[PDB]
Design a protein around this nucleic acid. Structure first.
Lengths: 466, 465, 466, 465
RNA sequence: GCCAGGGUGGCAGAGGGGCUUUGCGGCGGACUGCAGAUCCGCUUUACCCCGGUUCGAAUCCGGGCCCUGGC
RNA sequence: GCCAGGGUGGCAGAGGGGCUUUGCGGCGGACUGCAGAUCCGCUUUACCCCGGUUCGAAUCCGGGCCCUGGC
């Protein structure tokens, strides 16, 4: 609550300790669902692919390459100009844009247009307009989507993917330029060593013998459940465009092209093994809450609506903790004072005999651990659950005590003169006045986790209002 | 050059002042083409589309939304499940993927479509989580979409970027959309918002929730465009219709807001034509600055010898003061030895009535607004000299280097005497300067001009002993 | 509210239009304080200094310099080693660290320790440990705080400040290296042209004649209320460290040092003219809300707590708009239905005669504009206010109507049989059932802005419950 | 090299296959020191402290807090207004600023102090806004603080970075602090939190609000440190006491959370000693990789002529197969002309019983774990060859270049015959290789070794006609 | 840094060795009023900081800052 | 891509031309019970996709995918 600067200055200057100890008055007194972990700020997370793409952007930028957007939709006449005869085997792995003619009848009519199968198809077009018109060397990059049909599968390969590519245009170029660029780039993503082998594919658009495959060594990978056990993985490729191809676009200068698969680099930088689970987690049921998250989701259902009632609840737990061993039958006044224009007396009791006030589980605490919600007691048997899971800070009596106080509160509204609520055996969270949204309940089942809140609460509260 | 600390330590515990002035001996002596601005670092420049995308990724994150990647390639049955009746239409604006049959031709269409808007992918994505994650759910995604519009590029482009988000919760209203729109747009500097109901009342959104958002950005008022009052339509949103949602087993309202990246990036980076902003190479937008072109203007022939330079420096020297003398006359500029052969360097003129040096000997090469000029440093030209970039190379300079190098060629061939002249400058070559074919080919393309002319009329004589 | 996937699928497949038009049921019906602009998400803004420092970090990184932290607290023996005799005039502008000896007695005892007056004092120390031990050239930078007492002022200069400095260590160096580096850096912050003049200060730690001052041309500045009218401003300096100084630390190689004032570059990149107002806005009363922000802060005080009551309020405005011209006296039933276990009749009226039901301002709307809150009517006289300020979307009758409905709601609780609330003349927001937090009210006064909500509302509501 | 498109266009409309194989003529022919890894780009690496600061600036922004700059230099009366009684103490840990009096000496202290914690600056900053801005107010600041601790650097450092925030509102509790702590720490990968009351109950926070926050980070379990169970104290917070607040006319509770950057950055980047993480130069942490040192191993003398190379390539060639032949013997490696003078190049050996080439002629120079080795490619060495970086230069190579260049020196001096030998390699020089003084001085400093040894025993004979 | 007029209450604005403005504005309040009102009550009695002069200084003097007509 | 055993309900698990498992689990419910229970009710009657065989296929055949003992 707010307070008075002057009053506190004038009292603190005379009796500082008083003022200080009094500061407590300005703090908010919280009802159960307003207490950490039940309260929390949140923040947006970012997807591993896009994190990687942005990193890659900064990687190429820092080594002097400039950003560019190449043509994505291209007349397949360009694959023919770039591959020669091999051209027809490349277009078999491509997609053609088809449209709908000018109702329920209509059917897609293919066209000549394609969706680039790789950044190269467009580098040519883009380079043709500026290779002889810009100061040399020209260093450009583009990280963007491409398409390539893959044996009609999502498992053998996704249909779309990102390629982080670049091009170096200079008068004098050797394969040592791709190597120099491959290293200056990967070394920023943590790789420490590199090996370059010649690609047996020897593609028509690359000067023969320049098409190199690049292997990098990454620490994170060493001793990994994968095959990249030794830390080495093929992470990129490159070459020097053929003059035959450059001609078809009238490019007079030699051009080094080095590109890389973004999906794979993300899998490495963020620890994934299944490309599809990495980019499409939701769709592949790869969702997950943390114990912390689930604990925050366990809420108290019935809660006293009066400052008086909160006290009443406090008192029932207060006096239940003390006299939790008084053999039955007994009774104690937990709270007496007035609420809602009338005096009230609330008592903790046990009617049955040959036992004690509170059952042997009244003090059990609800704690989340490795995905399940347990209703357990702080025993040297549940040490791990309490030291590793996250304790909700609610015990059976706590949940009950709030139930009770809400009841006696409702009574003193319905004018009634007496109300006595009692808890017997606990089968589930409901019996402890504790709930969780229907979505969290489904996440838990979907995830094959359990709710295990059971026990002998046997706690009774008698109230008499006037 | 490297030095010795003790030397300087003691060499100055004695007399500081001289030790200090001595330091200059450690500085590199630069030959003409190793001098600013002919030397410089460069760096990557990013593209405005992508910068904007990134700015949006951050803008969505700072307001709670987590990033997701939505299905791009989709069976057209999804568009049918989401639009219902009007679906027949909607599909005429999408593309379908076709493929070449494995002959033992013509591409054979399939039932797969490229998403025309992000919504097609959102329902799919949400069906796996909307019932198992704590509410609210706030997801977003800036990604590519494909749309055929008539079949023109001035109308719109085939591919574009959508920056959109979904907001799953138990109780939503058109107000949640407005709130989000503001939180996101305020971060790009928009100051005021106005919402209006979008007439097209699409069937995928609850009736009357589809809203069009207008925003006032200060950059825009005064705009050489029609956003002159500063307002512009920049986004749209709606709450999905349970008709569509129910098709995916999503049991809660879902707000969907989205905004076109291209329009935003054009506002932010100041572009008027989308295709010029996105594909500036393909649309002739290449652009070197003045400082960049100056950087490219180099001295063609330079003296390799240490004395080769001390020479041209003198040729340029004496001919600077005695440039005015009348013809004929001749001053001795240099004398010493190179390639182990003592020589004498002379600045001269033979003809009569004229003078030693033409009147353009001290004209400096300077770049301004894309053109390379060769002009004298007169008040008539201050603007060019003070807002353009002066190459630092004058007509004599360009020359004195060609001279001092031609004598170095005399000594190499045992020869005994050589005399190279200089009269009328019709260009850069004539002044011993060049620019690489690509920058020349650039200056042409950008319809720019080189104007290096003038009366140099300065001759050099030297004979190697 | 949530809904049923199956029920909606099975009805939409048969009668799509029905389902669709029915979708409206799942939308939340909002009470007045839950309507935009009264609702809004927010986000953290960043300070111009730190934005700039981070930009500068990326600027040096992209041009191949590496990050370093230099010594900030230094034995003044280092100024003596670096400046020679000029050393004592440099330490007069410095701060010495003083401590408190080992109560109320105690007094600070100076020491030999200083707080670097510039990044240079520390570059020497840092460079001594690695100039001969690392591959050449060495490119390092550091953007960090420095101190320099300035004639006992905050106006003539702040005592602390950031310096974004760097060093180039190579065997061969000329002043053309500082120029090349000054440009590759500034060109990233938008400057397009540069001029370098020799600094008359000719400082002892720089090889004579190398200490260059750097002037850059920036567009943003052209035609500016400043002196940088022409777009040129001195933005950095540089030099080549003296061998005399390098020796004192045993540095054998030549070193180029170029640094820059971060505060000034921020002022340019974010449009400020007073350094102190830029870094310490709060302290200099430079705070500010937007009309949008203030509009969001105008809340409705008394609000119906029953779905029934919201309707009642809706009806009073409903029937007040229609019959707002019926000469007095008159009366109309606005709403009749039951609320809280009893039937209720609410009427709009005017008891006085020779006028009409509603006053001539009942429809005035509260709109924020250029900082003041106005209670005005959509007249071709207030076009600008409505087209430029931000309309709250609340008019006198709206605020009142909610008051009323809350009253009749309270009545039907106190069992009462009749209640009649009436609005006469409006002097302020209070009279329209509209408030603003005490802080926003103070911001408005502090900012010298006004609240101008006046007018003849004269609206009456009679209710009769049973 | 540049080429002609028509040439290749037609030159292949005829026979593609050959036009393709022809392209290789456009590739640059690289001399030894222009080959990978002797060539490479480099780039700036950022410092872990500053990266962490930046990561925190983002972390605070994504949770609502706006950035502010707080007063650093402050009159000690503020510490007195905020701590009250215990203020006497608190000031003994701060520094005071002293200055030299303008003689017509010793520094004269003033009453100004460098802030030891961020709180000293927060009250000042908040007094101007806590009553005039809409609540809540959420501010933060990652900046420098000064603190004397005993007078040791192993204990703590004099300066450090504080990442802190304030949260002004009408109703706060210890819960707001925990919530914020989680929102901020979760973004650095901490998964579980435990809060405990800080015993020191400082007077600037309401009694019993001062909390110590412990967080579980997965990197930390297994930790070669004592955070082995993964938990660590990483931040602290409290709600200010109105005793302090009232001194500034702030009428609302204020939550203050703060966390040390240095500890966080050490966790994130894996450092055990703060001063080694912050000042790695001053504490000998310089570190070149293997690939970086390989890059620095260069061929000292290289043949300038085009044929100068075609030569050494052959010297290296024939001596590769016929390396095994017994002594004496002699093979003709090259014959053609350079500097316009036909010559013959021979690989030979005179002595007896031995062989042409020593047995270490094919030893490759490779870098591994900081040391430069000269070893043969045997299974005994795979680990070195497969995890280190092979310079690509073998003993003969290093040599054949020295040879082919010594004959180029024979032709330059009109001479007619020269013969250079090669026996026992005691090092890098002996194999015609060098590393710059700085990398050598580095390898020493990092107590690393160079091991270039072996029986080369290979001699070259050639006579220029 | 050199000559000079000067630093008054939230804004404004005269003034002047002791009491002393005034306007705007504000906030509290009253009203049979159908439009931006009317009226009563309201300040921390305000005159930068350090010295001097005096019984007394915002008013006088010295200095030091703070705006300037400035060189 | 080549040989072969094969793809059963949320998990598990036999089976087999028509009816047909079963265990775990779940959810709904009852209880005088002081600790993780007891009992009644509960499935979309489940057997990948396209053809064939048949009056009838999850059960038979051909093909196509999906795990494999694989070359």
């Amino acid at each position: 609550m707010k307070f008075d600067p002057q009053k506190y200055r004038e009292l603190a200057e005379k009796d500082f300790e008083a003022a200080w100890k009094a500061g407590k008055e300005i703090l908010a007194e919280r009802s159960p669902n307003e207490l950490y972990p039940r309260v929390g700020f949140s923040f947006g997370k970012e997807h591993p692919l896009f994190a990687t793409i942005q990193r890659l952007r900064e990687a190429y930028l820092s080594i002097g390459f400039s950003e560019v957007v190449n043509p994505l939709i291209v007349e397949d006449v360009h694959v023919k100009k770039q591959f020669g005869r091999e051209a027809l085997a490349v277009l078999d792995r491509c997609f053609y844009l088809a449209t709908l003619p000018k109702f329920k009848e209509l059917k897609p009519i293919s066209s000549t247009l394609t969706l680039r199968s790789h950044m190269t198809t467009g580098w040519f077009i883009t380079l043709s307009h500026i290779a002889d018109k810009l100061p040399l060397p020209i260093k450009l990059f583009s990280i963007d989507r491409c398409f390539r049909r893959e044996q009609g599968e999502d498992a053998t390969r996704l249909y779309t993917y990102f390629s982080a590519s670049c091009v170096l245009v200079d008068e004098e170029l050797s394969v040592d330029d791709g190597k120099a660029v491959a290293e200056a780039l990967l070394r920023q993503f943590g790789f420490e060593n590199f090996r370059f082998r010649k690609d047996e594919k020897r593609s028509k658009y690359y000067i023969p013998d320049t098409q190199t495959e690049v292997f990098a060594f990454h620490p994170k990978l060493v001793g990994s459940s994968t095959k990249y056990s030794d830390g080495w993985i093929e992470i990129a490729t490159f070459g020097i465009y053929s003059p035959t191809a450059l001609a078809e676009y009238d490019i007079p200068y030699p051009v080094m092209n080095l590109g890389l698969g973004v999906e794979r680099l993300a899998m490495i930088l963020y620890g994934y093994d299944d490309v599809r689970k990495m980019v499409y987690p939701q769709i592949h049921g790869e969702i997950k809450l943390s114990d912390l998250d689930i604990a925050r989701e366990i809420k108290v259902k019935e809660v006293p609506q009066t400052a008086v009632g909160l006290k009443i609840a406090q008192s029932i737990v207060e006096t239940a903790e003390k006299h939790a061993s008084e053999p039955s039958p007994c009774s104690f006044l937990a709270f007496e004072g007035e609420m809602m224009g009338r005096n009230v007396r609330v008592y903790v009791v046990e009617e049955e005999e040959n036992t004690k006030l509170c059952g042997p589980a009244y003090a059990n605490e609800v704690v989340v651990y490795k995905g399940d919600i347990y209703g357990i007691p702080k025993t040297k048997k549940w040490r791990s659950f309490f030291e590793e899971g996250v304790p909700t800070g609610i015990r059976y009596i706590d949940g009950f005590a709030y139930y009770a106080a809400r009841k006696v509160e409702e009574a003193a509204m319905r004018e009634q003169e007496e109300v006595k609520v009692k808890a017997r055996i606990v089968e589930n969270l409901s019996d402890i006045n504790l709930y969780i949204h229907e979505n969290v309940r489904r996440y838990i089942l979907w995830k094959k986790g359990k709710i295990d809140v059971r026990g002998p609460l046997f706690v009774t509260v008698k109230a008499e209002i006037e």
